[PDB]
From Swiss-Prot, chain A:
Sequence segments annotated as region (Heptad repeat 1): 170-211
Residue ranges of coiled coil: 190-234
Result after altering F138L: In strain: Eta/B.1.525
The protein's name: Spike protein S2
Marked site (Cleavage) residue numbers: R92, S93
Record function comment: Precursor of the fusion protein processed in the biosynthesis of the S protein and the formation of virus particle. Mediates fusion of the virion and cellular membranes by functioning as a class I viral fusion protein. Contains two viral fusion peptides that are unmasked after cleavage. The S2/S2' cleavage occurs during virus entry at the cell membrane by host TMPRSS2 or during endocytosis by host CSTL.
Phenotypic consequence of Q195H: In strain: Omicron/BA.1, Omicron/BA.2, Omicron/BA.2.12.1, Omicron/BA.2.75, Omicron/BA.4, Omicron/BA.5, Omicron/BQ.1.1, Omicron/XBB.1.5, Omicron/EG.5.1
Known outcome of mutating N106K: In strain: Omicron/BA.1
Swiss-Prot record, chain C:
Glycosylation sites: N25, N38, N60, T79, N100, N108
Residues of the full protein shown: 579 to 723 of 1273
Effect of A56V: In strain: 19B/501Y
The family this protein is said to belong to: Belongs to the betacoronaviruses spike protein family.
Name of the protein this chain belongs to: Spike glycoprotein
Amino acid sequence: TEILPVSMTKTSVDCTMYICGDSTECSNLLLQYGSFCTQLNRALTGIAVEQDKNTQEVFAQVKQIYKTPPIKDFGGFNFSQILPDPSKPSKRSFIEDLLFNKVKFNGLTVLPPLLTDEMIAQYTSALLAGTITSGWTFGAGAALQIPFAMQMAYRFNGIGVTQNVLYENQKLIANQFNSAIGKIQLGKLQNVVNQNAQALNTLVKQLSSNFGAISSVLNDILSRLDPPEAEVQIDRLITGRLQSLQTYVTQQLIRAAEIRASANLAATKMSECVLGQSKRVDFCGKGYHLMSFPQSAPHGVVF
Amino acid sequence: ENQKLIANQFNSAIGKIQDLGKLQNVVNQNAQALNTLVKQLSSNFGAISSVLNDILSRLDPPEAEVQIDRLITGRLQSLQTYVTQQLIRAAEIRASANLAATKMSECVLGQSKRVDFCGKGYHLMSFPQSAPHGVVFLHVTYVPAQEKNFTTAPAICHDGKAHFPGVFVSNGTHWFVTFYEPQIITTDNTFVSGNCDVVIGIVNNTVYDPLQP
Amino acid sequence: PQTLEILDITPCSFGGVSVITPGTNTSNQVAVLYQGVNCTEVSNVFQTRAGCLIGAEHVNNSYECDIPIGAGICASYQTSQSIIAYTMSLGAENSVAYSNNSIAIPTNFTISVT
Amino acid sequence: AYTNSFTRGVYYPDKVFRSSVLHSTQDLFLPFFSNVTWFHAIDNPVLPFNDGVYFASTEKSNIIRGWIFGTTLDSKTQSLLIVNNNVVIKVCEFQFCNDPFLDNCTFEYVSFKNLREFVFKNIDGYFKIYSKHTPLPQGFSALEPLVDLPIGINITRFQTLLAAAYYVGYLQPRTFLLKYNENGTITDAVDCALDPLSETKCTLKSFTVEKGIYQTSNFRVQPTESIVRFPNITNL
């Protein structure tokens, strides 16, 4: 069970509300700094469009959407919580719910992802129904059918293992599948959620920092002083809060390069372990790899 | 007799290029980085002006050093911001350059058995093209397109022997081995081990043997 | 300070405002998304999880989408022709006829030069 | 009568030469599709002057030969006497009656098928006079600076005089994106604040917007009133 991250949370910032909330003379002096948050907004929009590419490269590896047939004689795995149940209103799978169970506004805006949790779980069930009913041949075009006891035999012969193991011990596979996921019921995934949370929380708490001026709130500086000397005091607040944004955005760009490296690894594992069999040693799990199953955990994928 | 399939499709696909999203994005991203840097020479950053001559030659040097100190901080933060964006963007391009080096080695300088690494379908061969600040791979791939539906069983015991195969395929009444090329079932690509209680789902049918004729 | 009822403070409705357009070589009318705000605050009104989407028309059908709206909605430009806001279709709803005896490889091949 | 000035009142904001650039300046130009007041002299009443006016006319006989810019107009505020025979410009004061006669002063100066557009301005005591003579149609023509006068006065009222169809405009501070050509003149312009597609064009700094979604600006709900509360009539 390999837990790979795929996408960060999409965040866009508005400068004139963050630095200069409900102030006009702060916006005038922010204009005097030329154009710093035109490029800050282009930096964060480039991150946000990148997360949509990440989710659409990992899960959307196939054009069609395949349905599990109403009779499901798929060799016997615990596919009740794996394949989708029609009981839940916000439709997912309970295994996706098990991963869902374990995992404000000050200018910052958390934009929603395009590919919703129900639509990702439809991509994943298409990949599961593609892998079971059609094997590796669904990676060329649409699905091209293969029986389950024929496709795992071919997944033996493709790694030099003789085809006489799941052909003789299927009840071992279904029981170990129940037990190993039973041990499961997320170190990498909860980490990514937490690093995003501490990044925004330090950014919000910077508004309680005065950066060496008389106060950290806008109205007290404006009321106590006048444009002779309030000009100096508000300059410290702006250049303090603008360094806080550039620090946050630079940390977001480095962290988005890490998630894209793990999104190209998850796209490579979807192609070479789910849509086929990998001959590579210890790439799709320790041992001799037969087949993988994608599972759409939140902001990630579970192989 | 399918080099005529290839050549036409090779000419059509080079035509469809004639009839660059990743590469033009890279050229444009460098341009906006350079253009924002030059426009910072018209920003005051809190000083009187931005042209260094009139800060010196409008007012006294007593406080001109203070005003130029605010201006030099704004220019130096703008230069540091540009450099740290170039370092991040060069790490992105180096990931693409290591992917293009891996595709040169494994798709051009060899054949990749990896699924969907060198194009969709069974990868046959690539050709690099020396595109501006990049490379264009003409991934010649063997893609079967117009679907079908056969009928097969987990193994086929003929007279008591479970075979381990090449794909057993069958158009509806007779069994073929297989790309969609129905070849005769033969024990050359299927080897005998076990029995027909030792592979679940097994049905009973002939397996042509080549030693008999 | 006058009575003793406890009343919250939630910030004013702000957000982005995006313009959904086709090409200027294609059309001239645009849609206006309002990000995050429910649009009792702020042409054809339409509410989404992304926010209000005025100027375009809801369509109960589903197509392979062209202009990313967000949260499972996409916009396009067709029927004269207008701008429509629909749920993205994810591809054709194929059903594989899997049996205990079935296999498939496609008939012909295209030597695809990707 | 009121009418629609489609794309009019777009002049050159500076004497800088630029060639084939999309330059965005925040200068007071007449807004697109604004409300301009058609008059008929069949007389010429008082007009509102706020931040300069866009004048115009449509004559085949050149009959308008006078501008009178003054607050009091009784040789107290500096009035003008611009005449078009050459644009001879008398900035000195003449003793006017209720209606000045048709058919001690300070400054004198000499420089169907016609439009006479005359954008005025008064910023930093620099009385700008722009012009364009193009034989309100469906088109676009930039207005060149014809003369400038560093008078340094305040004017707030005027009245065009002749010896019969003159229009007035409303100049407001508004962002505008310009389009210079190879020749160095203005061939197109966009207001970037009139309709949502226009402010897309400023954020891209282009004219041919491609199909997509663009974060043009930010939405904000302004406060409506004030609620200040202090405890019950306690002390007394």
